[PDB]
């Protein structure tokens, strides 16, 4: 399972099981470019979030119900959707994944 492997490799579930996570299959520069696109509000209310003009290839990783450390289990869902990231810093780059419309 792609999710069970990438979450492990990326050290996301080596010392615990993370409920959800999304992996973007686009170039890093292309994703970093989102910090200058459509500005929108973040889930929390703050407004340093941005939505992509286009849809991007992504894989959603969702833990199953029976999952428990040390045996985390994930449901893999591939899709193409707009991403919403919160930016910060200089250069202005993404630091959090807010959602995917």
């Amino acid at each position: 399972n792609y999710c069970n492997q990438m979450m492990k490799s990326r050290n996301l579930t080596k010392d615990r099981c993370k409920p959800v996570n999304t992996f973007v299959h686009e170039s890093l520069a292309d994703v970093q470019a989102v910090c200058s696109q459509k500005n929108v509000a973040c889930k929390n209310g703050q407004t340093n979030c941005y939505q992509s003009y286009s849809t991007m290839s992504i894989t959603d990783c969702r833990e199953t119900g029976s999952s428990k450390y040390p045996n985390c289990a994930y449901k893999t869902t591939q899709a193409n959707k707009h991403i919403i990231v919160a930016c910060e810093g200089n250069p202005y780059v993404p630091v959090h994944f807010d959602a995917s419309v």
């Binding site: 992996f23 994703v31 910060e88 993404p94 630091v95």
Partner: peptide, 15 residues
């Protein structure tokens, strides 16, 4: 050690 931007990259990027 690992910055907020580096964390994002390790956790979400997979070109």
């Amino acid at each position: 050690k690992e910055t907020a931007a580096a964390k994002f990259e390790r956790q979400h990027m997979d070109s």
